[PDB]
């Protein structure tokens, strides 16, 4: 119920939206650090994905933190120090000391505090980003009472963007971390653009006349404490109210009680049987794998050929063994038709095809509108028919500088007459004279006997509807075969035995990557089981077969006797014969429907209130 912030800037009101971001796990075993004069503990904590800094302040002890990789003037590091005058944020190669501290001196003659020692960094060589805030005055006084202010900070380092969420909440607890819920909001975004893996807290050092000795021993430590958390990426539900502030949150990985709210998308859970998931690990990284034939596809020649074939004989070229960069295809701003049936041009950079076929011919303006799947005319019926389930689209543009000469260009011949309707993706080259009446037409060209091929009149001053338009037809095929032609997307490294969502040759799913000993035929690419789910992956970058282990595989039934009624729930495992369970718990009972934990068993026989299965009934009693 702590560390919850706004993961997006989109305003939501009375809508529960599931988020997958770096969030603080519920009831985590966070580390506790204490600094009591009576313990100046300033360790270096690892920065895996994010650290939630929980600390309560009563005398302005904690000032800032040091962020970097090595902190030895060898890599780029981020400095955050909150002095008594201004706030200094710099990105330089600082040489940080072993135990950095800020020294504040106190005078017996006059009750005033003034920082005197600044021992944080030795020197800075090269600086990239520097931030200076407005000046302000802080009293920097010591309090003999209990804690008053609590400061919460969330650190995130994604794609070089440093987002810090802070919130001030007044508390009166002495030592224990306060409970309840808080909402955190961004205040500034820092484009540091560096890799940070280690960090250390920077406190304030107080000196006065009550601590005799040298500089290294003559000092006292203020009464302060802080806690260090970890941001594990887990799915969460956040309750966005009408004011835009999150008043409560729902976990999906702490307990089966929490995950029941996650599946139902509601904060209140009534009585019933719910199936959320088995023992489930939230995904942390993401992987994409595509074939690595980094070769440009040759459609730049088909779109720029020196000459184009006729309509009755359209040249078709197979495109394969290359990556198809469609960014130079739908962004040319020089074509005239891009109605793409089925798939969308925005998804052409993601999908993978078995092979790409590119037809080509030249057509007039009036017949460029009738090359859709369901259409009729003298072209779609006799010359070029697309299937009703056609994938891909035609591309046409004006051809007046080329293929347009005075006196008429009669080189092309379209099929004006034909005996029957044309089958889809069929090319007809036949010059036999078509007859109409019962008179024989054995090669004659008399009455009721016309040449099936009619020439075209292409003049530079002809009408726009009769201008010759160069038409190229891209067709995509999806067959049970490895995809030799894919989008220009790259491929990351391959991970194993970890619940990681994957992107294999255009197929996206979440699971655990495990080695498979099954022998896979070269014709097939994907393996499907009886349940019709993905089981085998070819992985064309390495050409090895991996078995997809589901992250959740067993059946879990959560016996929840309401939310306000009781906070105790029972977990029933269907595939477990009482381990791969959420928790061991107590009162483990094995029934015919499976293994039930968290619920007691009695030898009596009462009325069935909450059925379990196979005659087993459970109820909430005293």
């Amino acid at each position: 119920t702590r560390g919850v912030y706004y993961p997006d800037k989109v305003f939501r009101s009375s809508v529960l939206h599931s988020t997958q971001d770096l969030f603080l796990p519920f009831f985590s075993n966070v580390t506790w650090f204490h600094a009591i004069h009576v313990r100046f503990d300033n360790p270096v904590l690892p920065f895996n994905d994010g650290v939630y800094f929980a600390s309560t302040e009563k005398s302005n002890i904690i000032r800032g933190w040091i962020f970097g990789t090595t902190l030895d003037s060898k890599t780029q590091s981020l400095l955050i120090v909150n002095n008594a005058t201004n706030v200094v944020i710099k990105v330089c190669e600082f040489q940080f000391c072993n135990d950095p501290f800020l020294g504040v001196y106190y005078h017996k003659n006059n009750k005033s505090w003034m920082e005197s020692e600044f021992r944080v960094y030795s020197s800075a060589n090269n600086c990239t980003f520097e931030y200076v805030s407005q000046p302000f005055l802080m009293d920097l006084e010591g309090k003999q009472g209990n804690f008053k202010n609590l400061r919460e900070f969330v650190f995130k380092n994604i794609d070089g963007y440093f987002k810090i969420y802070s919130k001030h909440t007044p508390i009166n607890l002495v030592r224990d971390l306060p409970q309840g819920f808080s909402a955190l909001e961004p205040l500034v975004d820092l484009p540091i653009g560096i890799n940070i893996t280690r960090f250390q807290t920077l406190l304030a050092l107080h000196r006065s006349y009550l601590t005799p000795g040298d500089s290294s021993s003559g000092w006292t430590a203020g009464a302060a404490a802080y806690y260090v958390g970890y941001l594990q990426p887990r799915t969460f539900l956040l309750k966005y109210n009408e004011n835009g502030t999150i008043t409560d949150a729902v976990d999906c990985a702490l307990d089966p009680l929490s995950e029941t709210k996650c599946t139902l998308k509601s904060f209140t859970v009534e009585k019933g049987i719910y199936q959320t998931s088995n023992f489930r690990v939230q995904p942390t990284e993401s992987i994409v794998r595509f074939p690595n034939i980094t070769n440009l596809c040759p459609f730049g020649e088909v779109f720029n050929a020196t000459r184009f074939a006729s309509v009755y004989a359209w040249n078709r070229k197979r495109i394969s063994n290359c990556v198809a960069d469609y960014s130079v295809l739908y962004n040319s701003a020089s074509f005239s038709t891009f109605k793409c049936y089925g798939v969308s041009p925005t998804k052409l950079n993601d999908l993978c095809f078995t092979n790409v076929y590119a037809d080509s011919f030249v057509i007039r303006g009036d017949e460029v509108r009738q090359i859709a799947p369901g259409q009729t005319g003298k072209i779609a019926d006799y010359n070029y028919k697309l299937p009703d389930d056609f994938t891909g689209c035609v591309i046409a543009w004006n051809s007046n500088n080329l293929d347009s000469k005075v006196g008429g260009n009669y080189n092309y011949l379209y099929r004006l007459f034909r005996k029957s309707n044309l089958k889809p993706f069929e090319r007809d080259i036949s010059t036999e004279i078509y007859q109409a009446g019962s008179t024989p037409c054995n090669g004659v060209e008399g009455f009721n006997c016309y040449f099936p091929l009619q020439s075209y009149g292409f003049q530079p001053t002809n009408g726009v509807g009769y201008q010759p338009y160069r038409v190229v037809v891209l067709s995509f095929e999806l067959l049970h075969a490895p995809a030799t032609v894919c989008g220009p997307k790259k491929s990351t490294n391959l991970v194993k035995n970890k619940c990681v969502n994957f992107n294999f040759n255009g197929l996206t799913g979440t699971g655990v990557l495990t080695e498979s000993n099954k022998k896979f035929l070269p014709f097939q690419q994907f393996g499907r089981d009886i349940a019709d789910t993905t089981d085998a992956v070819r992985d064309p970058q390495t050409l090895e077969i991996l078995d997809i282990t589901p992250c959740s595989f067993g059946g879990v039934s959560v016996i929840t006797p309401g939310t306000n009624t009781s906070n105790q729930v029972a977990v029933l495992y269907q595939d477990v014969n009482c381990w791969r369970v959420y928790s061991t718990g107590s009162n483990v009972f094995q029934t015919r429907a499976g293994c039930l934990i968290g619920a007691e068993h009695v030898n009596n026989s009462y009325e069935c209130d909450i059925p379990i299965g196979a005659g087993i009934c459970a109820s909430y009693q005293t």
Partner: antibody
Amino acid sequence: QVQLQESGPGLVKPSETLSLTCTVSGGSVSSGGYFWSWIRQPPGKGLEWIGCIYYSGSTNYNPSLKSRVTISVDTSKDQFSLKLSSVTAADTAVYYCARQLWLRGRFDYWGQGTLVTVSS
Amino acid sequence: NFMLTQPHSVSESPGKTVTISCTGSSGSIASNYVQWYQQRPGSAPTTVIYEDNQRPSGVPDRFSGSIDSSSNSASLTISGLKTEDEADYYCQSYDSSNVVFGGGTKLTVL
């Protein structure tokens, strides 16, 4: 997600220079190869398309309002602006800036409607 | 010289269907797709129907779209009207180095 927030004064003198700056936050102007464009609409009338831009310097303009618009992309500030010259009294309209997922695709994400009025 | 023509104002009783037609002037309508927008007053227009009949997330199933190359017109059909459907409607298509729009059909309910 990503959103577009417009800026610039709403009071322009006739036959002067107009300067509107649409700032995009939560995303990258150069990355993705997305087309940024401008759309205006007179009050009570239909929408009018002004011009489109790429992440490079390539620009497309409407033929009716040609030789009056100059849109540029500032990748350092992650914003794209517009420059209108010789503003007439009929140019009083709500100006919009919209990202395009595709060159001839939908203006999927729109900015808030800013009011620009031509008055002396 | 391509422009889109639609009726200026089309109104219908609630509970029935209504058809809004967008017709091109010179060029064909079967190329470079079409887009439908709904502009609530005092707000930016939002996409309702894109592509032939594709619909973005957050748009009800009542908004149905179809094309007609023979009539050179694009049709948007709304069934089961509501108070929130009272807004300006626009049709958008693409031409050579320019994007075209329409006059704007003002739909009124009740």
